[PDB]
Amino acid sequence: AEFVPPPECPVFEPSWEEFTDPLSFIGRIRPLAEKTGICKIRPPKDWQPPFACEVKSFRFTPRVQRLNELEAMTPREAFGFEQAVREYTLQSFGEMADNFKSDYFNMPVHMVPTELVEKEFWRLVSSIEEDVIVEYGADISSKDFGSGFPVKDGRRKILPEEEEYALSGWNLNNMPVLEQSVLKVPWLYVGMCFSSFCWHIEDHWSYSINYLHWGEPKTWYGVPSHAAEQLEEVMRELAPELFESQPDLLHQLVTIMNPNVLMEHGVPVYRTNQCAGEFVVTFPRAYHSGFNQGYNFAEAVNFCT
Ligand SMILES: Cc1[nH]c2c(C#N)cnn2c(=O)c1C(C)C
Ligand SMILES: [Mn+2]
């Protein structure tokens, strides 16, 4: 009855030579990675961009997430009122997040095995006897708060040691984002234990790339694009009737589904733990979902080839 972890997605460890151009590298690994939907890329050991967000002034109001909101829908008094959220700094959010996780598991946050957090996450999502509520930061533009990468924009100070990172093609501010036609900037994610995102693809079936600047790992699940329609059919068969008819862009706001359910219906699913300093790439029309193991900070952008 415990969750069965999907097989691991490919992890690549490029040489310095392979690491010069991200689009060339992604094009070369595509024959394998597009068959798994997601892959993980570990930069060379010495590639360590400094964290460039203005942490002192970094303030944000997280949103609240109830893990079992869908299963709970199987009329509670005064529904719609979450209590409420307050404004945090990055530091005070992290204090809240660590206290939550260490209290939840009764152990220091870094001693909780990633497989236990995963098993407990999926138990909680389906449990009606236990309502767990977490908070996270998303819908956070790097244009308002600053990028996690140094940028030669004249707004902060680049040190000489930072300049190579401001100019690197793996700096997500330097990824190509313009689609060709006859006719964006990176976003930031502040996670805590159990905060999660449900199954979705990107607009225009775009690639996406995500960098975990620091913190505890981010656990991902990915489905290759060749199984996109099978995943959509399982969702339709098993989603609530009230939401079955909804357009994809709205339905993707509530498409939470245990990976084992998809696997039981023949949908291939792969997993990974993205750790600090690692990239995850999602391929075009590769459904993905995931959750955070603890307090962390990621940056992501949709790019075009
Ligand atoms: C909403 C959301 N989406 C994503 C993606 C994607 N795609 C990757 N990480 N990630 C997140 O951590 C969050 C929240 C929980 C902080
Ligand atoms: Mn995504």
Swiss-Prot record:
Binding residue positions for 2-oxoglutarate: Y136, S208, N210, K218
Domain of life: Eukaryota
Binding site for Fe cation: H200, E202, H288
Domain (JmjN) ranges: 9-50
Localization per record: Nucleus, Nucleolus; Nucleus
Motif (GSGFP motif): 146-150
Domain JmjC: 164-305
Function per UniProt: Histone demethylase that specifically demethylates 'Lys-4' of histone H3, thereby playing a central role in histone code. Does not demethylate histone H3 'Lys-9', H3 'Lys-27', H3 'Lys-36', H3 'Lys-79' or H4 'Lys-20'. Demethylates trimethylated and dimethylated but not monomethylated H3 'Lys-4'. Regulates specific gene transcription through DNA-binding on 5'-CCGCCC-3' motif. May stimulate transcription mediated by nuclear receptors. Involved in transcriptional regulation of Hox proteins during cell differentiation. May participate in transcriptional repression of cytokines such as CXCL12.
Subunit structure, as described in the record: Interacts with SUZ12; the interaction is direct. Interacts with the viral protein-binding domain of RB1. Interacts with ESR1, MYC, MYCN and LMO2. Interacts with HDAC1; this interaction impairs histone deacetylation by HDAC1. Interacts with BMAL1 and CLOCK. Interacts (via PHD-type 1 zinc finger) with histone H3 unmodified at 'Lys-4' and (via PHD-type 3 zinc finger) with histone H3 di- and trimethylated at 'Lys-4'.
Domain description: The GSGFP motif is required for the interaction with SUZ12. The ARID domain specifically binds to the CCGCCC motif and is required for the lysine-specific histone demethylase activity. The PHD-type 3 zinc finger is required for the interaction with histone H3 di- and trimethylated at 'Lys-4'.
Record: disease: A chromosomal aberration involving KDM5A has been found in M5 type acute myeloid leukemia. Translocation t(11;12)(p15;p13) with NUP98.
Similarity comment text for this entry: Belongs to the JARID1 histone demethylase family.
Record-given protein name: Lysine-specific demethylase 5A
Organism: Homo sapiens
Lineage, uppermost ranks: Eukaryota, Metazoa, Chordata, Craniata, Vertebrata
Gene label: KDM5A
Portion held of the full protein: 11 to 588 of 1690
